[PDB]
Design a protein around this ligand. Sequence first.
Ligand SMILES: *[C@@H]1O[C@H](CO)[C@@H](O[C@@H]2O[C@H](CO)[C@@H](O[C@@H]3O[C@H](CO)[C@@H](O)[C@H](O[C@H]4O[C@H](CO)[C@@H](O)[C@H](O)[C@@H]4O)[C@@H]3O)[C@H](O)[C@H]2NC(C)=O)[C@H](O)[C@H]1NC(C)=O
Ligand SMILES: *[C@@H]1O[C@H](CO[C@@H]2O[C@@H](C)[C@@H](O)[C@@H](O)[C@@H]2O)[C@@H](O[C@@H]2O[C@H](CO)[C@@H](O)[C@H](O)[C@H]2NC(C)=O)[C@H](O)[C@H]1NC(C)=O
Ligand SMILES: *[C@@H]1O[C@H](CO)[C@@H](O[C@@H]2O[C@H](CO)[C@@H](O)[C@H](O)[C@H]2NC(C)=O)[C@H](O)[C@H]1NC(C)=O
Ligand SMILES: C[N+](C)(C)CCOP(=O)(O)O
Ligand SMILES: [Zn+2]
Ligand SMILES: [Zn+2]
Ligand SMILES: [Zn+2]
Ligand SMILES: [Zn+2]
Ligand SMILES: [Zn+2]
Length: 412
Amino acid sequence: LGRFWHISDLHLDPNYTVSKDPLQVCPSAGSQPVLNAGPWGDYLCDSPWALINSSLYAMKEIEPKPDFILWTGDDTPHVPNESLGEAAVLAIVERLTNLIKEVFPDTKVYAALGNHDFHPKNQFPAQSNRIYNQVAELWRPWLSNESYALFKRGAFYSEKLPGPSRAGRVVVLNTNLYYSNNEQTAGMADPGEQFRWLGDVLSNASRDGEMVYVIGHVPPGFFEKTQNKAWFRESFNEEYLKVIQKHHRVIAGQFFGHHHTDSFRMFYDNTGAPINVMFLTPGVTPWKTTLPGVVDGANNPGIRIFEYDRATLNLKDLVTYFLNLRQANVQETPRWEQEYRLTEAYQVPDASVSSMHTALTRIASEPHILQRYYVYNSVSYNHLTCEDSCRIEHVCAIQHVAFNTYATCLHG
Ligand SMILES: *[C@@H]1O[C@H](CO)[C@@H](O[C@@H]2O[C@H](CO)[C@@H](O[C@@H]3O[C@H](CO)[C@@H](O)[C@H](O[C@H]4O[C@H](CO)[C@@H](O)[C@H](O)[C@@H]4O)[C@@H]3O)[C@H](O)[C@H]2NC(C)=O)[C@H](O)[C@H]1NC(C)=O
Ligand SMILES: *[C@@H]1O[C@H](CO[C@@H]2O[C@@H](C)[C@@H](O)[C@@H](O)[C@@H]2O)[C@@H](O[C@@H]2O[C@H](CO)[C@@H](O)[C@H](O)[C@H]2NC(C)=O)[C@H](O)[C@H]1NC(C)=O
Ligand SMILES: *[C@@H]1O[C@H](CO)[C@@H](O[C@@H]2O[C@H](CO)[C@@H](O)[C@H](O)[C@H]2NC(C)=O)[C@H](O)[C@H]1NC(C)=O
Ligand SMILES: C[N+](C)(C)CCOP(=O)(O)O
Ligand SMILES: [Zn+2]
Ligand SMILES: [Zn+2]
Ligand SMILES: [Zn+2]
Ligand SMILES: [Zn+2]
Ligand SMILES: [Zn+2]
């Protein structure tokens, strides 16, 4: 039984300062007053370094020798582009990279860029550029010669897993190419040929008897905290689904971030069979989202460990740990605690597709499992009751990655 960490959406705010002026605590809060800010963060702000540093040392205390770490990006604060130039973006990525290397010096890391890990934000090109080149240098100790060259061209690559994993591979995607807000890829059907490449990698995995973990930042499908919000342009969403439907047999897991909340996505084939599951891990940043329509969209800082079978990559469980930020900010040292273990929360034997399908059916039919899922969705920040509209937004998002079936579900 192996273990790996999945961390995402650290979002450092470099200028976080405990101040008596509520409007000069953190630029990531915009114009919002930040009253009595604490040293470990505030729900209106992106992460101070002290929170990020806390999260990495909490990982080391919980499991200092993971088989590997998945890191799915988004390192910089939610501020205007004019406040955050290219040099600062790269310095922030480098600082976080060095922290991970310092705390886990012997651990392989599989790292993807998030949509904020660029200047201007979200404008990821389908060709080489200074950011891809420089990040490739930062992550070179983690990259094969082949992955190094591929990262410079498109910030995507695939790597063998280390022993003792029998026949495993991690595929690292740049799904920021597919974000609707990315004008660099408008009018391109296969930017960087990433979909063609991905299919070839997965065909190779089948030929070679390997199983694959796919990771990336921006997920396909919709955002469970609202209605009708998808990140991918529709054509890219369709193409991603087509890849999963063709190659699901070799995909043992999908691991994404970007939402900052805790959820999962089911994939089905045209016979209704469940064929894959994507796990959306919460963020370390607690930052209350500015997305229109979302009310009180903050979360507690979260980190996640997966348990897996090294021989098959079958996912046996996940444990999510969290920092109760409200409590931590009256304390001398933040102390992270277990939030939940998946098998216990949903009374399923493992984290397989069949088990996650059962979890979904219980979320959709049992009030107390729905509420349990909903509390964990914000990393136990919000304990209010998830009513009917909330229920339908979450169930439809978990169940339907496709645009058209999601929309029909929302008629419910
Ligand atoms: C699916 O599997 C196939 C194998 O069946 C795989 O094809 C292999 O791809 C690798 C990687 O591109 C090829 O190896 C390269 O070969 C070329 C030509 O000999 C070399 O130039 C490369 O080596 C140099 O590259 C750098 C310079 O650009 C140097 O810095 C570096 O140190 C090397 O000196 C590299 O070895 C290999 O030839 C093919 N094999 C076959 C049979 O085609 C394919 O890539 C897989 N598909 C995917 C999407 O991964
Ligand atoms: C955070 O604040 C910096 C300015 O802070 C100063 O420069 C840092 C390098 C560091 O030494 C601090 O202690 C200093 O007090 C912002 O950077 C400036 O942004 C303005 C635009 O508003 C720009 O005109 C300046 O050229 C920038 N300065 C530098 C040195 O680049 C930065 O934007 C703030 N970060 C965020 C996320 O808002
Ligand atoms: C990052 O977090 C670590 C761990 O909490 C801090 O290192 C500890 O600091 C305390 C007090 O200085 C010591 O008692 C411990 O021995 C240190 N190490 C460990 C493993 O606990 C470190 O100071 C933090 N760094 C920053 C910049 O905040
Ligand atoms: C709005 N949101 C926070 C839920 C998703 C966008 O995430 P981010 O890329 O701005 O960090
Ligand atoms: Zn984010
Ligand atoms: Zn954003
Ligand atoms: Zn099939
Ligand atoms: Zn993001
Ligand atoms: Zn507690």
